[PDB]
Ligand binder design. Sequence first.
Ligand SMILES: [Cl-]
Length: 502
Amino acid sequence: TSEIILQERNSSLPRVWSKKTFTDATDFLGCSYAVENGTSIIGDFANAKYPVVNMKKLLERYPSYINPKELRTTETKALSYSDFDRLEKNKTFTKTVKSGFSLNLGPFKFGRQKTIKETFVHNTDDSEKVVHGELSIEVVNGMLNLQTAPSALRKIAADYLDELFVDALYNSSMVELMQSYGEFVLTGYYTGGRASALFYGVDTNSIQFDSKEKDMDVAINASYEWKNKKPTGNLSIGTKRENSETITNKFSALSYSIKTLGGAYGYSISTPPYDITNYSIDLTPWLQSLNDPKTHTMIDLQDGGLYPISDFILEENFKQRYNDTHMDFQYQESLEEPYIEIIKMYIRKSNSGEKLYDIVPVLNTRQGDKLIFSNPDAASQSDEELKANSIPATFLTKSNAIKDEKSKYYQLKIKADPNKTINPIIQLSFQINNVDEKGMYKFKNANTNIWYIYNPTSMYCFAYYDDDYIPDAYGILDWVNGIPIKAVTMTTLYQRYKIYGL
Ligand SMILES: [Cl-]
């Protein structure tokens, strides 16, 4: 509203903010994993999407980053849940994600409900009577782990990312990247075969969450048979005769659908829904197909076997955006026009209680991050100086002076606005102190084709994949071409610099 342009985006610059560019069980490691848009079966190989880590390249240099271990066990787990928050009553999915990460369960819960609704015939059912069930039957044969020491993860980020993942990182929005890849990277899983069954019951007489869950607990447990459960037997789902009374005594209807993971002679595609007392399926051939380990696949996740994508990238702003987007704090559908806004940054309250501000250029990136170019010596200044930034006349002079300077390096829209505040001291924005376009060097990483432009006095760095369309979006191609080439090692860069992706 009181926004005023100080420089139109140079009109000869283009307006382009983006470009739209499993043999065996061990190949899932370092791939993205889809929660929201997957099958909702935890650890299901189908939810493995695309490679994030270039594993072949990594293992060619450091073979010890991978660590397989033979297992020979069987596992059954049953879960009953009256609603989609109760889905996580045993933290089944929660504990698969890296300990300490801020996990948003919404998408997982949404995906399960979406699947339930697609798997089971459309209903008039009174949700009060509804309870859900899940069964897992697993022949476990192996275990795969990627090294996850932070220093390992940084090395991977720097040099061992899949080039199409690097593409998505710089040529689409984080939103788009998560739609295509999913939200997590596979670091720890189990291999073998698995039968997975979902149940949908209408409890005849209980509406209490716990009572219905105990009813489902009993039903699930009366509804399958594993005789002689040897690892490394007969298996069937469905009740008959005596066991059917166990079900009908508590449920007016209980239906199920199964899906087998790996093996042969099973059910690769989720089955239509069947009444538990009417239709039984013999999985015996499928179970004994699992004696051929060639038929094995990814079947479940290790605790902490899923790492956020943010652990696999160096860029501060992408890391934060991934996190914020996952948490539903931010959502930019697609990359946009960058611009510098000269606005006010909160510093402190005067001894009269008055808010005092510095005037600051803030680069808005394609991704919509705000990179505040702060003056850390602004806090030293005396109250009356800072208060003079509230005078329209000093704002004119300073804003125009900053524009005159930054204009030498950036040909994008520069605007000023005396009524816009940005507060990084109390709060997405980032602070980069002592930004100075004159003090920079650059080098290209040969493995990844990323340019890293770094200021070795102030310890900040702007990164971008090597396609001129990007510097052109910021109208900085001239400037960057003039920047002298000076290599620094990746480890020095990420250990000693803050890196921001343009
Ligand atoms: Cl049926």
